[PDB]
C-alpha cells in the first residue's frame, strides 16, 4: 500500500478519505458499480443520477405545434 480517516465500504472496494452524501448529482469521475466522485474542499462519493425528470402532458385531444426555429452548427 502507498506509505502514509473515513472508511466507507462500497460495491467495488472501500475508499479512504471520502464521505458519502444522500444527494445524487451528475457523474464526474467514475469509480464503478454505480458510484462517482468529485470535488465539492472535500471528495464526495455519491450514486449517479441518470438525468432531469419530466413528463409530457398526454391527452387524446391535445397537440403541440412549434412557432419558431433555430439553426445550429
Amino acid at each position: 500500500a502507498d506509505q502514509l480517516s473515513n472508511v466507507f465500504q462500497t460495491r467495488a472496494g472501500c475508499l479512504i478519505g471520502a464521505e458519502h452524501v444522500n444527494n445524487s448529482y451528475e457523474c464526474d469521475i467514475p469509480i464503478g458499480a454505480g458510484i462517482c466522485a468529485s470535488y465539492q474542499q472535500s471528495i464526495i462519493a455519491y450514486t449517479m443520477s441518470l438525468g432531469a425528470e419530466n413528463s409530457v402532458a398526454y391527452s387524446n385531444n391535445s397537440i403541440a405545434i412549434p412557432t419558431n426555429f433555430t439553426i445550429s452548427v
Binding site: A33, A52, S55, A57, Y58, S59, N60, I63
Partner: protein, 308 residues
C-alpha cells in the same frame, strides 16, 4: 419480429508476475532479466476493459432526460402492458425482460460493470415512454405531445397508404397488434435456441479462462511442475536453469490468451456500433431503407434490455 445483438463482454484483468512466478523472489529477478513484456500485457487488457464501458454508454444513453408515461392509460385501444415496466415487483422490469433475464443461465480478477441493471432498465423505460407519448419529435428537439391514433395515421401516410384506411379500421388494427405481442412472449419462451448469441459470448470467454489455468499446471519440460521442488530440492544454479525454461513456457501461454482477446474485442465493437445505428434510425424515427428493420414496410420499434 425479433432481433438480438450483443454489445459487451465481461471485463477481466490479469497480473503478470503473480501468474508467471508467484511468491518466488529469485524467479521475479529472472523476470526483470527478460525485459518489459508483462507491462505492455497489462496495458493491453486495461485498454479493452475501458472499451466495454464505452460500448454500453454509446448504445443506451441516447436520451438526456427521463420521460414518464401518464398514470391513466387510454391509448385508443392499444395495449402496451407487456412492454411497459411492471411496478408490483422488485427490480421493476417488463415481463418480456423478466423472461429474457431468466433464460440466460451462466492472479485473475473480474471488474464490475460501470452501469448496473437498474440503470439500463431505466434507459429502456425512458425511451419507451418518449416514443409512445411524443412520436419521433423528441429525437430532434423538444418533445411535442400527440394522441396515439393520429401518430399511427402519420406513419401510414409514410409508407404510401392514405390515412382514412386507418381511421375506418381502428378496431381491427388494435386487435392485430395486441395478439401479435402476446404471441411473441410465448414463441420466445418455447424454443431454447432463441437466445443463441448472447449465450455464445459467455461460453467462449469462460472456456478461454479455463484453458489458461490448465496451462498453468503443465510442466513445459522439467523434472517437476511446481517451482518449490526445483528450487529447494535441487542445487541453486541448475535449478535456475530449469526455472528459466519453465518461465519461457508460461510466458508463451499468456501471449496467446491476450492476442485472442484482442480479436474478440474487435468483433464485439463492430456489433455494438451496428446496434447503436439500429437504435437511432429505427426507434427514434421511421426507416425507408428496405429490410434494415424487419420484413415488410416499417412502422415503429420497441427497445428491450438483456444481460449482455
Amino acid at each position: 419480429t425479433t432481433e438480438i445483438l450483443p454489445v459487451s463482454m465481461t471485463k477481466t484483468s490479469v497480473d503478470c508476475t503473480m501468474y508467471i512466478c508467484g511468491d518466488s523472489t529469485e524467479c521475479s529477478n529472472l523476470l526483470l532479466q527478460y525485459g518489459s513484456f508483462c507491462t505492455q500485457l497489462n496495458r493491453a487488457l486495461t485498454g479493452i476493459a475501458v472499451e466495454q464501458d464505452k460500448n454500453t454508454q454509446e448504445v443506451f444513453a441516447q436520451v438526456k432526460q427521463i420521460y414518464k408515461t401518464p398514470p391513466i392509460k387510454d391509448f385508443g385501444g392499444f395495449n402496451f402492458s407487456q412492454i411497459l415496466p411492471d411496478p408490483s415487483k422488485p427490480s421493476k422490469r417488463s415481463p418480456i425482460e423478466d423472461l429474457l433475464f431468466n433464460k440466460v443461465t451462466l492472479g485473475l480478477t473480474v471488474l464490475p460493470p460501470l452501469l448496473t441493471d437498474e440503470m439500463i432498465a431505466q434507459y429502456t423505460s425512458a425511451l419507451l415512454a418518449g416514443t409512445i407519448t411524443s412520436g419521433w419529435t423528441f429525437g430532434a428537439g423538444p418533445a411535442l405531445q400527440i394522441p396515439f391514433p393520429m401518430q399511427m395515421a402519420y406513419r401510414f401516410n409514410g409508407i404510401g397508404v392514405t390515412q382514412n384506411v386507418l381511421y375506418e379500421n381502428q378496431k381491427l388494427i388494435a386487435n392485430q397488434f395486441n395478439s401479435a405481442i402476446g404471441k411473441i412472449q410465448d414463441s420466445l419462451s418455447s424454443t431454447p435456441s432463441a437466445l443463441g448469441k448472447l449465450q455464445d459470448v459467455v461460453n467462449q470467454n469462460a472456456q478461454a479462462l479455463n484453458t489458461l489455468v490448465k496451462q498453468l499446471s503443465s510442466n513445459f519440460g522439467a523434472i517437476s511442475s511446481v517451482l518449490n521442488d526445483i528450487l529447494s530440492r535441487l542445487d541453486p544454479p541448475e535449478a535456475e536453469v530449469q526455472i528459466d525454461r519453465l518461465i519461457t513456457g508460461r510466458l508463451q501461454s499468456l501471449q496467446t490468451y491476450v492476442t485472442q482477446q484482442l480479436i474478440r474485442a474487435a468483433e464485439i465493437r463492430a456489433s455494438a456500433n451496428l446496434a447503436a445505428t439500429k437504435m437511432s434510425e429505427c426507434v427514434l424515427g421511421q426507416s425507408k431503407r428496405v429490410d434494415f428493420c424487419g420484413k415488410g414496410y416499417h412502422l415503429m420499434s420497441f427497445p428491450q434490455s438483456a444481460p449482455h
